[PDB]
Amino acid sequence: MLKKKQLTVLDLHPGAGKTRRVLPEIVREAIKKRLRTVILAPTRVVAAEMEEALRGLPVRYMTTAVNVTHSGTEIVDLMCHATFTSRLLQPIRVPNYNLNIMDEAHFTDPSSIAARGYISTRVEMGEAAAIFMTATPPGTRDAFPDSNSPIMDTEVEVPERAWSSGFDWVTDHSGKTVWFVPSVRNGNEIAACLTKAGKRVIQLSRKTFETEFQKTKNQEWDFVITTDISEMGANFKADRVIDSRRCLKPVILDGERVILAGPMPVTHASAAQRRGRIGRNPNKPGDEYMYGGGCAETDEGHAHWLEARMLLDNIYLQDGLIASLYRPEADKVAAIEGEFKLRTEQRKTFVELMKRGDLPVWLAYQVASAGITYTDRRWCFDGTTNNTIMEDSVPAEVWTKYGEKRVLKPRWMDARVCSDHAALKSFKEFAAGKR
Numbered sequence: 001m002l003k004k005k006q007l008t009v010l011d012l013h014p015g016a017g018k019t020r021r022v023l024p025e026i027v028r029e030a031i032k033k034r035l036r037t038v039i040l041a042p043t044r045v046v047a048a049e050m051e052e053a054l055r056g057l058p059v060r061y062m063t064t065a066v067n068v069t070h071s072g073t074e075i076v077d078l079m080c081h082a083t084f085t086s087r088l089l090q091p092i093r094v095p096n097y098n099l100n101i102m103d104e105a106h107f108t109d110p111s112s113i114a115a116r117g118y119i120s121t122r123v124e125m126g127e128a129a130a131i132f133m134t135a136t137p138p139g140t141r142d143a144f145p146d147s148n149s150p151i152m153d154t155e156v157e158v159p160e161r162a163w164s165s166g167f168d169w170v171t172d173h174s175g176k177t178v179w180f181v182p183s184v185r186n187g188n189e190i191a192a193c194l195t196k197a198g199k200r201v202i203q204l205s206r207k208t209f210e211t212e213f214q215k216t217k218n219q220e221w222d223f224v225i226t227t228d229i230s231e232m233g234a235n236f237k238a239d240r241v242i243d244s245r246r247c248l249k250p251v252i253l254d255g256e257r258v259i260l261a262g263p264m265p266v267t268h269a270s271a272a273q274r275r276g277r278i279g280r281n282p283n284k285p286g287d288e289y290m291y292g293g294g295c296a297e298t299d300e301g302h303a304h305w306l307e308a309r310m311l312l313d314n315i316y317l318q319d320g321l322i323a324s325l326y327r328p329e330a331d332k333v334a335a336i337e338g339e340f341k342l343r344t345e346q347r348k349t350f351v352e353l354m355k356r357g358d359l360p361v362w363l364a365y366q367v368a369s370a371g372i373t374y375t376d377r378r379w380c381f382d383g384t385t386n387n388t389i390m391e392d393s394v395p396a397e398v399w400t401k402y403g404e405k406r407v408l409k410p411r412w413m414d415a416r417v418c419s420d421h422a423a424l425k426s427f428k429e430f431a432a433g434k435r
Contacts, residue, residue, distance in 0.1 A: 002029060002099055007123045007130045011106075013146040014135045015275030019103060019233070020053045021047075024318040026101065026131065027057055027076060035098040035129075039078040042104040042232040044210055047080060049233070050103070054078075065210075085111040088118060088315045089351050098128055104232045105132035106269050108299065110361050113266060113308035113325065115178060117418035120317060121323040127320050136269035143271035147279030158244050158292030160186060162193035162262070169290075171197050175239040178224045180231075180274045181281035182263035183247040184420040187225040194223050199255050204230055207422055210221055228266070231273035239284065243274045245293035250303035250360075250416060257387075258303055258362055258414040265296035313340035314347050342368060349374050363414040377401065379411040380431035389412045391424060401433030 001008040012018050023039070041047040044065035051059075051066045059073040062083065063151045070174070077095075079087075081102070087094045100119045105112075122128040135145055145155060159167050160181075171194070181187040184205045191201045201213045204226040205218070216224060216236060224236060228247055246263035247270065253259060266274070271291070278287035312323045322337045324330060342350055350368035353359045357374065359367070372379055381400070389408040391394045396408040396418075408431055410417075417427040429435060 001026070001032060001131055002035060002129055003130055004098070004211050005123065005126045007120055007132065009138055010131055010133045011135060014273070015148045016135070016278040017051065018133045019134075020359065022134070023050070023101070023103065024057065026054055027059070028086065031058065031097050035182070036095055036316065037099040037101065038084065038097040039076065040081050040084055040102040041078065042081055042101070042107045042112065043229075044080060045213055046103060046233040050078060068105060078433075080206040081107060081109070081115050085114045085118075085311060085315075086355060088114075089311065090355075096122075100128055100130040102130070103131065103132040103133045106136045106138070106233050106273065108302075108304055110304050110307035110311060112423060113305060113329065114311040115313070116326040116329070117308060117312050118317070118323045120326040121317065124324075125318075136206045136272045138269070138326065140269045140272065142371055143268040143275065145272050145276070146329055148277050148278070148282045149225060149285040149287070151275065151279035151287055153289050153291070156290050156292060157347065158242055158290060159193075160191065160244055160246070160292075162189055170242065171199070172379075173240060174223065176224075176237065177242055177243075178226065178236050178238045178241045178277050179242040180226055182227075182248050183242055183260075184227060184422075186244075186263070187227065191223075191225045194225075199223055201225055204234075205420075228270060228274075230277065231270055234277070235280075236277055238278055240288040240290070241278050243289065245271060245291050245295065247298065248419075249298050250362075251301065252303050252306060252362065258360070258416065260415040260419060262298075264298050265294055267297060267299050268295045271295050273371065281425065297312075299329075299332050302332065303362060305329065306335055309333060309335040309337070310340040310350075310361050310365045314342055314350060340365060340369075346371065356435060358426060358435075359430070360414050360416045363412055363417065366412040368388040375433065377431055377433055381406045381409055382408045382414065383411040385409070387411070389413075389424065389427075390419050391418075396424060396428060398428045398432045 025391050047063045047065045058074045059076045059078050060070050061068055062079040119130045123130050187203050191203050194201050199222040201223045204212050206229050245266055246261045246268045248260045250258050252263045275289045317323050346368045348365050353364035353375045387409050399405055418424040
């Protein structure tokens with residue numbers, strides 16, 4: 001697989017040993033052939049598990065998740081998918097890796113889609129080799145792949161709100177359950193219902209993942225309530241997965257706003273990855289998978305793919321050439337290559353609104369493309385009356401950097417800045433000039 005010009009998809013079933021067995025062998029072969037290599041982890045939690053599997057091999061860990069003193073003689077770098085894309089965007093030269101390995105290559109966050117598009121383009125050009133590691137490559141239609149041990153698959157009605165009766169099977173279980181919910185707010189209601197029933201519940205989401213995932217190892221628990229982030233390599237010692245089979249879909253309406261549509265069905269890849277959390281121990285047959293809906297290709301028209309085109313249009317590749325999306329996922333968005341290419345100063349603003357501002361890609365692009373500078377926050381208050389952001393059914397208010405109390409009313413409305421309490425608190429700090 002290491003020969004130039006080729007992209008290999010390593011699609012072994014979940015738990016087949018892609019990370020702990022195949023990855024170290026690939027790395028040893030790459031170091032033997034003197035290939036400058038990058039290893040891309042979806043999260044800092046996966047990067048730490050990779051360090052355990054790669055111990056004894058010269059790897060440069062470009063992440064604060066690992067505490068290792070580097071020798072300086074490493075030709076293999078390890079970083080998360082988002083750091084790879086961010087460094088490509090920033091005015092820092094990234095080496096032209098001869099071998100690019102992406103673990104959990106099914107990750108649908110805009111930065112992972114951009115990384116696959118950039119790497120696959122370099123491979124098409126004949127400059128590099130790549131290995132995409134995932135049980136569920138783009139376009140997979142099988143939500144029931146193979147496993148290390150047999151799984152009991154049961155289609156059943158799964159509660160998406162607090163319940164008082166009709167779901168005895170949920171609480172009458174004596175093992176550990178991983179339950180996938182469509183959103184943080186939906187998880188809060190179910191966790192509260194399970195806590196009132198006497199269950200020990202841990203909740204996981206993108207922002208709290210690294211911190212709260214440690215609790216799954218450090219303390220006894222009955223249920224883990226998680227968004228889709230746990231589809232990316234998160235391992236549990238559990239015997240059941242309850243799957244709502246639903247997710248939220250960011251959708252761009254009329255090219256002027258982003259809504260969080262749904263909950264709606266997950267893709268086959270997401271369902272197979274959610275189910276993939278169990279049936280991993282060959283000595284423990286009969287782990288359960290309870291699913292409450294069907295699958296659909298909800299990645300079509302999903303804003304993450306349009307956002308990946310905004311990132312790819314602003315990454316230098318060669319003169320005016322622009323990287324295409326990875327072919328199997330390239331029809332998910334109606335987009336013309338280069339339509340989002342920004343001039344030098346506007347691109348620097350676009351990068352800073354994402355990196356320091358913490359804004360979603362689409363929103364950062366609207367602000368940068370309008371000729372607004374990073375610290376100018378007047379756009380957070382000059383939108384139409386229908387863009388008024390609501391908190392507890394009352395308009396959200398902030399003291400501007402001038403000392404004036406104003407209602408948060410952004411010129412461009414992106415529902416992701418207020419998807420939960422923590423998101424809106426962060427956006428209010430942004431509108432106030434606090435970062």
